[PDB]
Amino acid sequence: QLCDQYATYTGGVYTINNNLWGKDAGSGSQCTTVNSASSAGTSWSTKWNWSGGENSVKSYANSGLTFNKKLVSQISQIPTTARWSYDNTGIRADVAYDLFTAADINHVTWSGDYELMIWLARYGGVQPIGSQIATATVDGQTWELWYGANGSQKTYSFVAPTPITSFQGDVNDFFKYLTQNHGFPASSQYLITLQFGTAPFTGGPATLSVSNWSASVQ
């Protein structure tokens, strides 16, 4: 039961972090519970109540994968499944994959030269960094594609037009899209991080239950 800002637990190839990186922007608390974490997947939940700092993310409690880092151009597949639900959707928050890449394979793993997000859900109109630049079709499904930047990190967010509580896909289809359509430098960027979780702004109490998350990088 993980309540502290960087409380964490690792089982198998999964690492679950409470990751209350934004806690000083508001008032409240958040605890993350690990149900299972094995070679094959992980199940966990996080319960939070946040107020204040309404335009600032308070946290990104998440499960992250331990994998062999490699150039995005050398990746064949990133198969993943995510099944989740929120008990309370009267909130301002999003549910998302978060991936970082860097030119340095030893970059710090909480940021990148690039970031790729895949938002399975958003509540209350909260939005990714930047602006919508395209509607992208990936594996036969449409995504709003956002692009933003903070002057070091450049972030592409693929946003689901409606909530996807049971997702199965290959994240490498998204990297391929970026490489082929947006000049993403796949041959000089290492994939360094692959996480799935939720980013709350305000609301609660609310509980994200992740009944299963799996991924691999081949």
Ligand X SMILES: OC[C@H]1O[C@@H](O[C@H]2[C@H](O)[C@@H](O)[C@H](O)O[C@@H]2CO)[C@H](O)[C@@H](O)[C@@H]1O
Name the site residues for ligand X (rule: CB under 6 A): 19, 21, 57, 60, 98, 110, 115, 128-129, 155, 199
| CB of residue 76 to ligand X, shortest distance in Å | 26
Nearer CB in complex with ligand X: 5/29: 5
Nearer CB in complex with ligand X: 8/29: 8
**Contact present, 66 and 13 (Cβ < 8 Å):** yes
| CB of residue 118 to ligand X, shortest distance in Å | 12
| CB of residue 211 to ligand X, shortest distance in Å | 21
Report how far residue 115's alpha carbon sits from residue 140's, in angstroms, rounded to the nearest whole number: 23
As to burial, measured by CB atoms within 10 angstroms (0-12 exposed, 13-18 middle, 19+ buried), residue 181 is exposed
Only one residue has tokens 């519970």, namely 33
- Please count the CA atoms within 13 angstroms of the CA of 180 that sit on its side-chain side: 9
Query: CA–CA distance from 69 to each of 48, 155, 156, 161, 177 (Å)?
Result: 32, 19, 20, 31, 20
| CB of residue 140 to ligand X, shortest distance in Å | 26
Nearer CB in complex with ligand X: 37/61: 61
Nearer CB in complex with ligand X: 112/169: 112
